[PDB]
Amino acid sequence: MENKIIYFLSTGNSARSQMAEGWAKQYLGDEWKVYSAGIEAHGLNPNAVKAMKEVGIDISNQTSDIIDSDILNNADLVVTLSGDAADKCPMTPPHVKREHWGFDDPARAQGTEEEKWAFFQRVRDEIGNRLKEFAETGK
């Protein structure tokens, strides 16, 4: 099938989803369509831009929007991409499969330069491996 819609749902959509859609499109080609939202989403945290620059992917052009049922309910798959509840606790209607793949948030790093990069880098490695696995399995 030329196009298979898949969704990230994550607090603020500021960082992890921006990173994850960058990771996604290097293994999930035009055969897939990849979208991202959250509670009050509309932002591109420069930490996620840096996280993709660690692996030579550009995301500086990217955007986000609030949760949008017209595309989320049209997806096959919702990645919950946080281990957090401020995301308006979405309930993901049964038109779509769901699983949680995130477990932490690099936007909530301790705030030293070292802990910031460490938080980005751990989540960047995790998200990259997870999207690579998703391309192999199709989940």
Binding site: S69, N73, K88, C89, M91, P93
Partner: protein, 104 residues
């Protein structure tokens, strides 16, 4: 009158007449257990003029997904079979009573 409960089509059967406050709650969130007592506190004050209805968004979430609700809490204010106000976030009792009093 009471906190009524709805499902896939019984939403419409309960909202086509009067002024009616549909609410959406489930175990997923904390507000699900704060909006709930707030709605019972609303009914015992002004349920003389107002129906309240709930969708459990795990048992009966079909109505929510159909309308494009996907989020907690959610509130759809209706009168005579159409929505007139919408809310996709928690409100205290006084603010929630005001929200419906605008159109009641």
């Amino acid at each position: 009158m009471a906190i009524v409960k709805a499902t896939d089509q019984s939403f419409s059967a309960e909202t086509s007449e009067g002024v009616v406050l549909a609410d959406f709650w489930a175990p997923w969130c904390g507000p699900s257990k704060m909006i709930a007592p707030v709605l019972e506190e609303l009914d015992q004050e002004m349920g003389d003029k107002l129906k309240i209805v709930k969708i459990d968004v795990d048992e009966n979430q079909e109505t929510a997904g159909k309308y494009g609700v996907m989020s907690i809490p959610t509130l759809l204010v209706l009168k005579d079979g159409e929505v007139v106000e919408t809310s996709v976030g928690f409100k205290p009792k006084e603010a929630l009573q005001e929200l419906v009093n605008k159109h009641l």
